[PDB]
Amino acid sequence: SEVAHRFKDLGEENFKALVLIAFAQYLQQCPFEDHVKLVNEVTEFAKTCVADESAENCDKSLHTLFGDKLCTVAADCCAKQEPERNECFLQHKDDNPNLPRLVRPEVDVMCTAFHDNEETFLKKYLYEIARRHPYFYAPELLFFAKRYKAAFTECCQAADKAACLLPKLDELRDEGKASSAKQRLKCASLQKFGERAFKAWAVARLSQRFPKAEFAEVSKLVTDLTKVHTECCHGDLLECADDRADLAKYICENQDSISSKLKECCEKPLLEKSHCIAEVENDEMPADLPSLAADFVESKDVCKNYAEAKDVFLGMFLYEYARRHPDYSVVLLLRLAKTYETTLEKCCAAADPHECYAKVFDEFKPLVEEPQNLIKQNCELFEQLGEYKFQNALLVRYTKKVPQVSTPTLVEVSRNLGKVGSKCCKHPEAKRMPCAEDYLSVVLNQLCVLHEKTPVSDRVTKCCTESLVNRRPCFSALEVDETYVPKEFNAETFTFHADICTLSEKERQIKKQTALVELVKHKPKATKEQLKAVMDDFAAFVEKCCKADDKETCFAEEGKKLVAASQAA
């Protein structure tokens, strides 16, 4: 029995949470009560299996069971069987579910609901997250759950809870979203590019982190880590959580052989141990490391070793170049690795290989400089305009690049792209690249998955599927879509009402930002000069109407003077 197996390993508390998340991610539209019902029904069945490991259908696989329990409340997916059925659900996960924005009741209400029924209060948090983020890293979701519990348990018995809770919750909302984003990239990598692309990313990344660890060790870690994510991304949550635990035990046992900063980590609860390890800082670089040129360019055995085991050899190249370059981003190392392999494949087929592949490092120079100059420039620019105007500049830049993309998506992606400046520019040159480029990877992956749902721009598709590691350079290289045909104005689209006054300070910018996007789609060829001169106007239209006697009509009157002057520029 598989269910009995995983139940014992995870316990009832985790087993129940993990199954709840699985159901929330598969059927994101179904209400909370229903999932809760199926979880219990499933959980009890599991208890009978622990005893009689041959009772009802304790012999069946998790998917069969989970599948049959969801099919009692869903249709074409359920008409299929075993493999096809499961794949069906996976293909129907929705990265942008049409769910109602989540609003939080007054502190007083939450603390009452928390104190009264704690298990329920926590199970609904899990449910509301898992249904909105169908790819959230299950094991980590359990970690956020506990921290959420600690938030309430502590703040609800204080002087001013509003002051104690609200903050801790915002920090959690953001970090939860970041977390969801990073995991969305790993699944896309696996699902759209293959495990080989995933493995290479891990080798380079872990080699940067555990520079003292041996290649064979990293390889071992990478292999386990791959299976872990392969499972979480495919919906095998229980085994994912299980396997993740094992990997944490291993890493801790073999500390000495991996990294010296794993101490603090291995001295704490499971959930906190895993989370700790996954976010540990890079270890100190081994003192005397030979030159790479020795074994990879000067040696006359290159092509022979390459021929013998192309995978192991290139894998070793990555590990070696990565370990001594924690100042490079993972994508830059992968571009280098790809440039090195391309040189061997051609050179090793020449008369005198050595001569041909002797200047491969000269090929690396341009690739390393591109990222640096880009970052340098844009951080300087960021420092000058600040985060709000920088987001605006990005909205104009990206709407011009790919005008077809839906206004909600452009607004969302550009805002996030703007956050890269705040999160990264503050670091010194040494840590900027990893920061900047790996964050751009996550955000542009967001644009790619939201766009894959309803493809409208061939330019987006090409930049998203041609190469995982070159997405950033591809998007960067786009200027303006010259074939794009301007859109015709729509009254409703540019009609500002008084309801924009009740909206938070941020909810306003977002509106003014959404207007900017529509404007650029209308006048692609317009200039950053005109645009700014027009935006300022919109600002004026809000301040007056929002504060001018009983006027829900100023929205139409003053909005008229708005569109009028708007149609002019």
Residue numbers in the entry: 5 to 78, 88 to 582
The authors write:
With a typical circulating concentration of around 0.6 mM, HSA is the most abundant protein in blood plasma and serves as an important transporter molecule. Later crystallographic analysis of complexes of HSA with specific compounds confirmed that drug sites 1 and 2, as they came to be called, are located in sub-domains IIA and IIIA, respectively.
Since fatty acid binding sites FA3 and FA4 in sub-domain IIIA overlap extensively with drug site 2, the binding of dansylated compounds specific for drug site 2 was examined by co-crystallising them with defatted HSA (Section 2). As was observed for dansylated amino acids bound to drug site 1, the dansyl group provides the most important anchoring interactions for binding DanF, DanNV and DanSRC in drug site 2. In each case the dansyl group occupies the same position in the binding site pinned between the side-chains of Asn-391 and Phe-403 on one side and Leu-453 on the other. In the presence of DanF, DanNV or DanSRC, the side-chain of Arg-410 is rotated towards the solvent or becomes disordered. This rotation reveals a hydrophobic flanking wall of drug site 2 that has not previously been noted but which contacts the apolar side-chains of DanF and DanNV and the methyl group added to the sulphonamide in DanSRC. The main contacts made by these apolar functional groups are with the hydrophobic side chains of Leu-396, Phe-403, Ala-406, Leu-407 and the apolar stem of Arg-410. Instead of pinning the dansyl moiety in position — in the manner observed for DanN, DanE and DanR — the side-chains of Leu-238 and Ala-291 are found to hold the Phe side-chain of DanF. The dansyl group of DanF is re-located to the lower part of drug site 1, which was previously observed to be occupied by indomethacin; as with indomethacin, the binding of DanF induces a rotation of the side-chain of Trp-214 (∼140° about x2). Since DanF was found not to be displaced by binding of drugs specific to site 1, we conclude that the affinity of this compound for site 1 is much less than its affinity for drug site 2.
